[model samples]
Target: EMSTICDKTLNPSFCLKFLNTKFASANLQALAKTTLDSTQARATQTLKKLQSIIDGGVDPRSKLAYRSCVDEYESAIGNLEEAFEHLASGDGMGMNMKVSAALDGADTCLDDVKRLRSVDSSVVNNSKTIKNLCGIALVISNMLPRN
Candidate 1:
């Protein structure tokens, strides 16, 4: 018993295309998740820097530095969001640029964080890679260096 949503939508050609898209997304998501650790690390690093400069009480005199850090942080957040969307859609296989873009954002953010903290912390894991990445970079406050 098939209840057609739309006569046109039920066409064999259209149905095939839709199914193909869904399948493709499923395949891509799997691949993307597998190699997402490094990207997560980079994003976390970038974000910490941006946060430190903008929110870590680094002084407001250096407007230029603060502005730059903010921009990088914003960009990192955007990229990371996009990456997550792609992953969610499961269509991330052919989207190499998306992954790179995410990593690039992290790189910029990390630059800011590193300058403030003077250390580089990048984490790689499946479940908590991104979280740990961000946490490690920001947790250092001249009290805890590495964890």
Candidate 2:
């Protein structure tokens, strides 16, 4: 999971944005915005997939064990979108909170999966790749530096 993230460098612009929000140059903002858009789109696709699974009723075991996780994923998607909106509105505090909430949702969803997997080894092993990818995103989200 970690390997994929280190390889892909999920949202590098997000890193730059994290570093300095006040880029005074038009060129910098343009460049940063382009990269940020790409990275954010990646994130959006990821969240959407997770949302589809939780929202799609992937399996009975998953549904029973991860309904909260499903809710969390859905909430995460909403919060993330709101965070970007806040970023646009220049509300850093709001963005931070929403982003935090979104990450928390991912964490909760992943936790639910971990617990479910523990009980159903066969199922998890069958979908190892998908599991790892989800794990990657969940870990990235949960590990976001806190304030």
Candidate 3:
């Protein structure tokens, strides 16, 4: 069961570590919820970091890019929270849609940064991980048993 779940993620090793360490004996529903929460936490932390950087002042030209990313991260957080709500309600389709939207929001954040020729390796790389985790959650969500 664990191997099958990890196999669905882009980073099988990461999935294994996260599941084995953080949530031993996690079923698919629990795995999906935990994945969404963990990914949401990363985005929230990144948003705070970005806000701090902006507060301290950055390249004026890049300010808009940073703000855009902040907005995207905020949106991703909302979508992820909604996904969790859907999960609790056993609305697997709704959960999948919300998580997918969150993933798209993360991607758009990275693209916005690139369009402005900004290079915040931390944010960009973290966005990649967030996307992967969201994908993993969506896979688990789809596998959830329906009524």
Candidate 4:
């Protein structure tokens, strides 16, 4: 249930706002699966958003940060794929490692974007949302068996 799993999340309210609505009665494993998929989907969306800003940019520093964020989001997408792979192979520890890596990517993106005042508010807002997703995903992953 969302009550059990989401309460364990760093962003429990965010989990309910998204995950619970989608899978209110789903099991732990299913929640973990969905979280990884959801995060990757968001990562892809964020990358596209950043790409557009990069293409339309006049500020050199902002453009560079956007480019850096593109790479970070790509890393999130790649690590997320590994989560699905290890999940299917029944390597819970491996899945968590990948999930954690994706989380790290999101963190880096948020940090990079915030460290500079040149980035748009929209971009920073999106980065924060993506980071929240990663935190929720990691908490769910932690609940799974590590062996």
Candidate 5:
């Protein structure tokens, strides 16, 4: 079961690190829920950090990057939590679109930084991490039985 789950992730080692008895015992639905929850937690942390930076003193030149990131992270959190609800209710079809959209939001945030050529690697790295985990969850969702 662990190997099977690891196979679905882009980074097997990373997945293995998070894999515990609970996750190893979960069905596909629960796996999706876990993934969404983990991704949301990371996004929440990143959003707080970004907000701190904005509150502290962002220069006029790079303000756009922070602003766009705040918007994207907020959107991603709402969408991902919605996806979790769908998964909990066994609404695979509903969760699928929301999960994909949330992943896109992460990419959008990272792209904002990429375009600015910002030296702030925290947001970009966290966004990429969540994006990859969401992709893994999406693949796992596809493997499950959808009603």
Candidate 6:
């Protein structure tokens, strides 16, 4: 059943990787929660990583890029948080919209950091992770029976 759901995601292996342990009981609601938690955690960690890079000093032009990225991640975290609350409300559709926006926010952040000379890889990696989790959330949300 985990694979059945994971197959609906953008990246099955990545989805399975994160959801495997959490899949013990198997319910879309619980799975959605896991996805939101994972996405939010990754976004928050990426913020810390970006802050570390900014503190270590970089070119002024690139500083704004990283700053922009920070803002995106901050916003994405907020979206993820709201999605969790919305999920708790039994509004899977609302959670889906929120998580999708967060995915777009992360895509924007990836674009923000892509030009950085030294910081692109890590941010991109984390950003991709966030997006993939968001993707899994999408699959779960779509199948979730509304209450």
Model 3 weakest 10-residue run by lDDT: 20-29
Stretches of candidate 5 above 4 Å error? 1-26
Candidates in order have lDDT scores of 0.46, 0.51, 0.84, 0.75, 0.81, 0.83
Find the 10 residues in a row with the least total lDDT in model 2: 122-131
For model 6 the local lDDT of residue 8 reads 97
lDDT (tens digit, per residue) of candidate 3 on 19-96: 875553246668886798789889998888778877888887778788888988999999999999988887888999
lDDT of 6 by residue, 1-147 (tens): 678889999899999977874554256667887778888888998999888888999899888988998989888898888888877776778888988989998999888778777775778899989989999987776765565
Candidate 3, superposed: residue stretches over 4 Å from native: 1-26, 115-118
TM-scores for every predicted model: 0.39, 0.48, 0.76, 0.72, 0.77, 0.77
Worst 10 residues of 4 by lDDT: 20-29
Residue 135, model 6: Cα distance from true site in angstroms: 0.8
Write out the backbone clash pairs for model 2. Answer: none
Least well predicted 10-residue stretch by lDDT in candidate 1: 137-146
Q: Which residue pairs does candidate 5 place in steric collision?
A: none
Question: What value of lDDT does candidate 1 attain over all alpha carbons?
Answer: 0.46
User: How big is the positional error of residue 36 in model 6, measured in Å on the Cα after superposition?
Assistant: 1.5
Sorted on lDDT, best first, the list reads 3, 6, 5, 4, 2, 1
Question: CA lDDT of 51 in candidate 2?
Answer: 54
- Across 1-147, the per-residue lDDT of candidate 5 in tens digits comes to 688888788998887867853454366766777788889999999899889888888777568788888898999899888888877776766687788888888998888777765547888889999999889877775654444
CA shift at 93, candidate 6, in angstroms? 1.5
TM-score of 3: 0.76
Extract clashing residue pairs from model 4: none
Off by over 4 Å in 2: 1-59, 118-147
Task: Evaluate residue 22 in candidate 1 and report its C-alpha lDDT on the 0 to 100 scale.
Answer: 62
